[PDB]
């Protein structure tokens with residue numbers, strides 16, 4: 736558990752029903768800059784930190800620890816450039832080569848999450864934080880679930896635009912459920928952080944998916960990458976590729 740050897744800044748990087756996110760510094764005589772989730776239930780915050788605790792990957796946000804003070808406080812290393820969708824909305828100069836590197840970084844941290852038998856559940860362009868223009872990290876483990884050693888999926892928001900059909904129709908979440916979200920994450924990435932399925936409600940998306948209609952190719956997206964998306968958006972999970980195969984394709988087309 737962390738000590739209050741921690742200095743918070745005043746600005747809110749962000750806020751929500753839980754509390755508010757601030758920048759801070761944790762003194763270890765080299766100080767670390769940190770992002771901090773303060774609650775304004777705790778149990779949820781404890782869950783989420785429990786998840787981050789067992790995770791260790793250059794492409795996942797690190798947790799430093801929990802600080803129990805005037806408020807409950809989840810402390811994480813700080814990804815300085817914030818959310819992918821937001822940075823991309825405001826950096827349309829970002830080139831295709833570079834978006835592919837960023838998503839290949841996501842697939843790699845996802846590859847690891849699948850090997851460690853966690854499901855993310857909320858993999859979206861708003862949950863991928865940028866360390867630099869060339870270094871991406873997955874965040875927000877609030878809806879993540881550790882899988883038991885016997886099951887392949889977890890049985891249950893929601894972020895319905897990012898959800899696979901089996902999640903909405905059955906409530907099953909597996910790592911190939913998150914492959915589906917990653918396909919939507921990639922489409923947002925190539926679209927420079929535009930919302931997916933604009934103006935459509937949940938049930939209209941679901942209806943659209945059942946017809947076999949997918950979202951279009953974004954503007955300057957390389958064809959291999961869009962074909963990668965349709966692969967990700969395989970309707971039937973048994974045939975949808977896991978992150979082992981998403982990551983292999985993405986690493987390949989990068990060289």
Ligand SMILES: Cc1cc(C)cc(Nc2nccc(-c3nc(C)c(C(=O)N[C@@H](C)CO)s3)n2)c1
Nearest residue numbers: 748749750751770811812813814816817874875
């Ligand atoms: C909002 C924001 C802005 C900027 C510029 C950087 C960051 N950096 C950063 N770095 C690592 C982790 C985090 C965060 N992680 C979580 C789980 C955050 C969080 O709870 N966000 C909530 C507002 C979404 O409701 S912020 N955040 C965050």
